[PDB]
Amino acid sequence: DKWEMERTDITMKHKLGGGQYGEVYEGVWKKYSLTVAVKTLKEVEEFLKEAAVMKEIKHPNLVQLLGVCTREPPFYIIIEFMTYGNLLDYLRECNRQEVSAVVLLYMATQISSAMEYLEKKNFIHRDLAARNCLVGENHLVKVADFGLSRLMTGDTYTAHAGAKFPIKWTAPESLAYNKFSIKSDVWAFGVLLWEIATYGMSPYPGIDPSQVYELLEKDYRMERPEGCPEKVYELMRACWQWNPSDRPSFAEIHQAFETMFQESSI
Numbered sequence: 001d002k003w004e005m006e007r008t009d010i011t012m013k014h015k016l017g018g019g020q021y022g023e024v025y026e027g028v029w030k031k032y033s034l035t036v037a038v039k040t041l042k043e044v045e046e047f048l049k050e051a052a053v054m055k056e057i058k059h060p061n062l063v064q065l066l067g068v069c070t071r072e073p074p075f076y077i078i079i080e081f082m083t084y085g086n087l088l089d090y091l092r093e094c095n096r097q098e099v100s101a102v103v104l105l106y107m108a109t110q111i112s113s114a115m116e117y118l119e120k121k122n123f124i125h126r127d128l129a130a131r132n133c134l135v136g137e138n139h140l141v142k143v144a145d146f147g148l149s150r151l152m153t154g155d156t157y158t159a160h161a162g163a164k165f166p167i168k169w170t171a172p173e174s175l176a177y178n179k180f181s182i183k184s185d186v187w188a189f190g191v192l193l194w195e196i197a198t199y200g201m202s203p204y205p206g207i208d209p210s211q212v213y214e215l216l217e218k219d220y221r222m223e224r225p226e227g228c229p230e231k232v233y234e235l236m237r238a239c240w241q242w243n244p245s246d247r248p249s250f251a252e253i254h255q256a257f258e259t260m261f262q263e264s265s266i
């Protein structure tokens, strides 16, 4: 297809993100003198399905695919490079006078827009967190999208036996029954909002992941962050409803943040 390109078009550089994303490298697309990111493979079929799914997604707030090398090993997935790294590091290291409350709303609006798109297009993310959001110039935020999966909105995924989850971002039904859906993404988005409001604090601070589920069962939820508007905290708490069906849609979340962002600018 039009996505296929030569490996020789790319000059490979160093591993990006301190190697936290696995085999993702900085690279140069020589034709365009352009810094790109490249995912390589050091299981093959799973990797090739990733490349296939990314061909289908197009949204200003999801990392854009640029090309693939899928004819012969080693395989490449070539994607745009996000200059300011991940949102977690960005928020932790930022000038808070620049990255103010209205900017926090802007970033939340961008992420919910990408998620509304996936919701509409029958996709599920399954690993939403600040570490998996990426930052460009002028507070542009794009959701990392290697592992996106096809799943009709409403339908459920059951994880493989012995699967390990990032517990503090993981919905109760996922933790107990390995069940994932667009509503578990909504839960994770709530934890992401908490990350944003606190400028990259670790969720449930001081609480060992092994004790999180039992807290959630007894109706414990994280406290409202300092300086966080109650209307935003209300959305967080709605995302953390025990029953997946009680949680709002990403369409509703995005509408809420759009309204709030527009009012904050005015």
Ligand SMILES: CCn1nccc1-c1c[nH]c2ncc(-c3ccc(N)c(C(=O)N(C)C)c3)cc12
Residues within 6 Å of the ligand: 015, 016, 017, 018, 021, 024, 037, 063, 079, 080, 081, 082, 083, 084, 085, 086, 134, 143, 144, 145, 146
């Ligand atoms: C498909 C989306 N995705 N999934 C995993 C990785 C990416 C990704 C795509 N494009 C990227 N562009 C940049 C980065 C990234 C993240 C954190 C970092 N500390 C750095 C970094 O070292 N510098 C030079 C800023 C780079 C990650 C990605």
